[PDB]
Amino acid sequence: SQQIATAKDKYEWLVSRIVKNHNENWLSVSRKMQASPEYQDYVYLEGTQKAKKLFLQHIHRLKHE
């Protein structure tokens, strides 16, 4: 039952693969990300705002882990 982990984990890379310096903006990066089944799948399961929230997290981590 490894989807909650891996699909998120992968998506969490998707963020790290696009959003490096955190200076990005979610919408624009989801523009980017949406061209990837990765972002889709996760947003399909969980949600776009939670993927935003997920972006935010990583952002913070980028900012200061």
> Which CATH number does the domain housing residue 53 bear?
1.10.10.440
C-alpha distances in Å from residue 24, one per residue of 1, 17, 50 = 33, 12, 17
- Residues making up the chain, counted from first to last: 65
How far is it, in rounded angstroms, from Cα 57 to Cα 15?
10
C-alpha distances in Å from residue 8, one per residue of 41, 50, 51, 53 = 9, 10, 9, 12
How far is it, in rounded angstroms, from Cα 3 to Cα 28?
26
The residues near 20 (Cβ < 8 Å, ≥ 6 apart) are 62
Is 62:19 a contact under the CB 8 Å cutoff?
Answer: yes
- Residue 32 belongs to domain spanning: 1-65
Structural domain total, the chain: 1
Run of H or E including 25: none
Q: Which two tokens stand for residue 16?
A: 């790290």
The residues near 16 (Cβ < 8 Å, ≥ 6 apart) are 58
**Technique used to solve these coordinates:** NMR
